[PDB]
Symmetry: C4
């Protein structure tokens, strides 16, 4: 018999149970930790993708208390210059700044790009995000040890992983956070192309339990479709959430608006798609090239997302995230329960800002 | 590791098993309790929503044996006027009308937290029951509100909600409510589970809350999620004493709101009270929509109660209390659900109780 | 503290496992029992519906070795006439005949319709089919007892039921077969309108285990979508299968062909639909002349595609069953039930079992 | 009560768990065994179907390191010539095909399908130099198939023989004891197959592979996972469970090299694809397959390239240097319906064409 280790759940499989509450949504606190040494004022990170995060999107994310990660599908000098435009940047009272009062910013790197790390460190990057399709690999782990050995005070994120053993390996190599998510991304085809993946709720749960033994936060990356998934990811034990598709159709993301059959869209594509890899430099992709509807400014998207998190926390009775994770209790639901949860049997006539 | 309390089920996960029957559907009795003191002659309540229940719909529901709950999306003066319009209304055409001791139609009215002024006026207007509703019933504000109301009006029947856990039912019952309303997330226009990730599938929520409310002798109202008459039967069979309905009544003559035509068909607006339009940035927990026009509340109510009577016939139950003692369920699969519905045949004529 | 007895399954939830086979599909025997005293030469019965079985359909079903049940949505004299047309009727070497060489036929009756039974017996009906929405009821049981006391030699089928205790009550009442099916019919809305029903595979299995203790056959009625569901139902322990929608679109069924958007259809409706009940409300109104209570139906009115002769449909259906018994290695229906082993499958396994990822260009005679 | 042996899973019910990896996808080795005595340099076989494999397709499959099985819906002389066209084909290309799958004389390897009782066909295929004969039935666990296996091995002890199709451990034990050199697994999974709908008989493919591998390993007999492969990730799943190779129909039917012509429908190009148990292939009959069409997808080489690239990527995720190491390391999770929708593309309209996903 084959080895089936567990039955794994994703976001749509579970719901949070309400608990006795003495707090209102507008009163809760949504600050969290990005790494062992960097805090966020709100728990959202924009994804490190060339249709999501350059300097315009990163500045707004940090102004709102979160973070943006500049994607690595550009030359070193262009990434340095994008980082510096963020660092050089009453209406944004929750801005996430460093000790010098400059906005905080992240930047993506790959294996074997130490010149890129050197230049981004010199540019004053706050955190380096070492990402890969398979974070639980010798190359990633050796690259972690190398960066940490040369820049001990540089906060370093590594991913992506989906198992507890992977979280142990990365924590023991010296990361300041692990990023969890193999397969959940809206534009990801890894589970279809290679057959590999772990549903995100189970992957978060498995990795948070291990990483907590090292005091290392977990970033939940991929598969967020609604503000409710942010709440579920945080309640299971993640410290922050990375989001791609829900921010790709905003004013601040790179790329221009275009019109298709009467509506406005922006491009949104995986970094492992043919289009992203060919602009960078027969390939076997693990992402698709797509479009998402234009949804206005990042500020209004972020406002609805955190408004859903605040409501969730209010339902559970939690004053802050750590209390949210302590109090959280779940129910596993069925396909019919999912249909009951969504809008059903009623035609929608007006566009809802947090539900599409 | 994360704490998963249970695997929770909703209406379409289960069906009632038939049992030996000596009763006929047209002879069973469908009276029930709304609160500890107020009875209903039939177990349906129209939702406290501004596209469902004002005075016109509240009168029909009461005339047919149930109850209408005036919504709170109006100033205090208008709600008092709506309630008094029901109490003044009224007979061989409505022999099951739900009346009070003075021969007046019974009617309820919705209130929010910290609206004592509203409670005072609806009491002096002769309201039969006050319905304290909130998105989160298991909260300090609701509990204190319950304590404050029952202290000032010990004889005013008070419904509070909405809840989805036994621990929430215990809290409200000890606070002194006369009925609890169960439903976090199941409503047709509700996005709470999607926006916040919080909710409990309705069958499990009812089951859990009734077990705890029964210890205090407190009836449970199953609010939201009803799509077919069979859902009414399952909710009552699980232990609910009554069912509150919105979408199935929004498209009727007696609901507030204009009839309008759209692409050849007539509709009425139907929207959640937590939607942007109802609350007028805001973070809504409902959506604004439309439902097809269906005719009078009377013809809808007739079909829904006919399904309930049919189900009680299949189970062999003479009344709802006997219904709850005899009821046995099976859990079914997705394939079982598809087999339960109409399948492999194109429907060509309208059926009054199936769409 | 709600009471969930079990997790119940239907046809699409299970598949038969193949077994070692020394038999060929064309060689297996598919004779079976309709009641304790009447045999069939193949296990198919056409449904007692006014869009499925009148004398034409019933003649063809008996000629092919099965049985047709004349529906009861007509006055007694009309049902008697339909029965006699069938009794009156070597291209059909498997024809299902009585001791006198006449085609066998069934006829439906309702609670308390003794006058209908007396006329059907006189017409030579071979089996009376006592039908109610709820067979596990005092009205049904009392009717079974009165018919059996008056006509001890008349074979009686009663239904429909879905539980062991229901099968026990009808068997002790004296039926010659029970008919199983609360909710599975293609045109049935009982489970949605009332919330009552049992998934059909579990209903058969539970009822067969109990009815077998009395030696009483089980008729699996409703929910058959493909020839593979006939195989599953018999493998679980049913002795025969009653079929509505797969036979409604045939030449022999009552009703005319009509065209809708370039293709032909026939009407198909539940006997508990508004349309089927309209005629009885019309008789009831003119008799008394009183404003009547509006009906609350448990079925819908629809249409099915035209599929040609009942002969070609039955041939394909029986071909699937013979193929299944070849896969299982079974020489006959009894051997089929002895050898049958199932797997429970997932929703993804159901998609894999159907045609997937390929657009169908020519429609198969046994698959849509 | 009815006997329910197990709850069976298929490809979409499971996912491979990532493991610690020191291997790059480029460096893994994907050779495997077709039978006890014939090796493949990549683990894919083209289906024995009159819309998939004749000589052109079998030539490309062998050039790329796999195998093609000439279908049996033709007279004996026609099948002999199809085999001869492959055996006499140039194996090398314009170092273009460095992984070509050859016999002892440097000729491309090829298979040919046969039915029960067609000994004259077997004799002619042997004389033509066929490398493997594929005795396929709808029901391999039958007395007719067992007897044909015994007759063929008695007359040609050194002819490699595959037999199928089966889906139970008992069926695998039967064929192995009869003397097959590989068993073919698959009752019902095929894209054009209706067996499970027409007869109610079948086993979901992942459980069927798992069950037959565990038995067939006791006899040293490889398992061929036949049918239901929709994506490259399904190939990885079948091998990880223990199958030694994978037989594919629908994904190769729309290629240049498959038999049958291109046609256009509504502005797009298609090739016909049909089950061999469909009415058209068999010419009242009772079919167990349908006739259909699949999109035109270009050359077999471009399809095979993306399929193997997905398996290589899968083995890199698991950390496996070759197939046997793949099967030792592989751990699975079982997922829900909601986990499958999260696995596919969701909430985003696909604009461009993906060579390995649609
Ligand atoms: C995130 C993501 N999701 O698919 C993705 C992003 C960009 C590119 C790719 C491509 C399409 C190029 N796909 C792989 O890179 N696939 C893959 C599969 C299996 C392994 Cl084991 C590895 C490894 N990469 C390394 C690294 F070079 F990073 F060190 C060591 S091992 C890589 C994928
Ligand atoms: C029924 C319902 N379903 O969504 C709904 C109806 C109207 C308005 C809302 C809006 C959109 C305004 N959403 C919330 O009100 N969301 C929410 C979320 C979490 C908590 Cl903890 C609370 C609370 N409100 C109170 C108060 F006392 F004020 F009533 C105490 S606790 C409230 C929701
Ligand atoms: C591959 C395949 N998949 O369906 C298929 C291919 C061609 C034809 C058929 C048809 C449509 C003809 N279907 C059966 O042949 N179905 C079936 C079902 C059960 C058994 Cl036991 C047998 C057997 N036939 C033999 C014989 F020797 F006659 F060949 C020995 S056992 C056969 C199926
Ligand atoms: C098959 C079927 N539906 O599946 C059906 C066929 C015709 C009519 C009906 C209608 C729409 C009229 N539906 C019921 O008759 N539903 C129902 C539900 C529960 C019980 Cl307990 C009873 C009973 N009626 C009797 C009587 F004596 F009156 F005939 C004895 S028991 C009846 C249904
Ligand atoms: O091409 C890819 N293949 C697989 N995953 C990707 C690819 N590109 C980006 N991702 C991941 O998907 C995340 C965004 O997912 P989303 O928020 O659901 O759209 C990113 O932050 C990456 O972790
Ligand atoms: O906007 C809202 N958000 C969530 N729930 C609502 C909202 N408005 C009304 N509800 C609930 O949904 C019920 C109606 O559900 P329905 O019967 O399925 O349409 C009401 O009685 C309320 O309990
Ligand atoms: O209107 C009805 N409501 C519920 N069940 C019905 C009705 N009319 C017929 N049936 C049942 O459904 C069977 C036909 O189901 P089918 O073969 O799936 O279409 C009949 O033989 C009856 O047992
Ligand atoms: O008509 C048939 N009925 C059932 N299975 C078939 C039929 N024809 C071919 N097959 C099987 O289906 C496989 C191809 O499945 P596919 O790769 O999913 O299209 C073949 O290799 C055969 O094993
Ligand atoms: K909802
Ligand atoms: K049905
Ligand atoms: K199939
Ligand atoms: K995905």
């Amino acid at each position: 018999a084959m080895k089936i280790v567990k039955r794994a759940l994703t976001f749509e499989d579970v719901l949070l149970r309400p608990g006795y509450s003495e707090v209102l949504p507008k009163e809760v606190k949504i600050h969290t930790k990005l790494t062992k040494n960097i805090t966020l004022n709100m728990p959202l990170i924009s994804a490190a993708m060339d249709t999501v995060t350059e300097h315009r999107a990163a500045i707004m994310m940090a102004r709102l208390g979160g973070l943006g990660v500049i994607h690595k599908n550009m030359d070193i000098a262009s990434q340095v210059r994008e980082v510096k435009r963020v660092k050089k940047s009453k209406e944004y009272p929750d801005a996430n700044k460093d000790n010098f009062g400059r906005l905080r910013v992240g930047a993506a790197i790959g294996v074997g790009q130490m010149d890129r790390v050197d230049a981004l460190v010199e540019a004053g990057v706050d955190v380096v995000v070492l990402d890969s399709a398979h974070g639980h690999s010798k190359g990633i782990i050796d690259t972690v040890k190398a960066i940490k050995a040369k820049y001990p005070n540089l906060d370093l994120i590594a991913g992506n992983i989906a198992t507890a053993a992977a979280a142990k390996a990365l924590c023991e190599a010296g990361v300041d956070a692990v990023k969890v998510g193999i397969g959940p991304g809206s534009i990801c085809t890894t589970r279809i192309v290679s057959g590999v993946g772990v549903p995100q709720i189970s992957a978060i749960d498995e990795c948070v339990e291990e990483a907590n033994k090292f005091g290392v936060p977990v970033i939940a990356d991929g598969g967020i479709k609604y503000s409710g998934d942010i709440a579920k990811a945080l309640a299971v034990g993640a410290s922050s959430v990375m989001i791609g598709s829900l921010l790709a159709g905003t004013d601040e993301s790179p790329g221009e608006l275009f019109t298709y059959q009467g509506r406005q869209y922006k491009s949104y594509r995986g970094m492992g798609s043919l289009g992203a890899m060919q602009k960078g430099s027969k390939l076997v992709p693990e992402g698709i090239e797509g479009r998402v509807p234009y949804v206005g400014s990042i500020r209004s998207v972020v406002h609805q997302l955190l408004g859903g998190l605040r409501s969730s926390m209010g339902y559970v009775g939690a004053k802050d995230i750590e209390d949210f994770q302590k109090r959280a209790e779940f129910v596993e639901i069925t396909t019919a329960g999912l249909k009951e949860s969504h809008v059903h049997d009623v035609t929608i006539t007006h566009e809802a800002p947090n539900y599409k």
